[PDB]
């Protein structure tokens, strides 16, 4: 019941954890090089709890309002964590409201989001997903790009009948200051989309973006995805709530 992608499965895998309330499982992430239990699939919900549990030492878990929508953001830096959790790595990830939709990034202890280990991912429950075949909807979108405190944000427009997803995000303190979808599309009535993207920011314009994501929930109440660029500083994960 869980779908999702990781830009680098040698660092991060996305998958399902068993749960008494979800026969298809709950969204989870596995850190390939971490100590137990974090090398198994760990529910994002448990990582949310860890971010709360270590908040006095530098982690955080915050409800952030974007437009009229809430995104729950978890920030887990290696510097805030005990030494045996060094191999757990650095996390920034968000949840689309209380929907079972997560999106975020990771990088290795001692690296930065500019390093090759900068990995982006999304994960979500597909059990109830239905995608309209006609009409249009907009989504309030938040994006994570090397920060848990300065989110990308903007509006994506889904044209369900044409099968297109369009829009632009901007940032106020991340590597990426603007990111535009280019030709991102999906078969009408189906959940998965993909296309290209262009970003601008601290390293200049980068037209090499590749976008992959999907709709989630009844009547496509959410979306999430990732964008990868030749410059991994610009690698971005995003999640949207249907307006």
Residue numbers in the entry: 22 to 264
What does the paper say about this structure?
Here, we show that A. baumannii Slam secretes HphA, which functions as a hemophore that acquires heme from hemoglobin and albumin. HphA is composed of a C-terminal 8-stranded β-barrel packed against an N-terminal clamp-like structure through 6 intermediate β-strands. Once secreted, HphA has the dual capacity of binding hemoglobin and scavenging heme. HphA along with its cognate receptor, HphR, function together as a two-component receptor required for full virulence and facilitating extrapulmonary dissemination and/or survival in the blood.
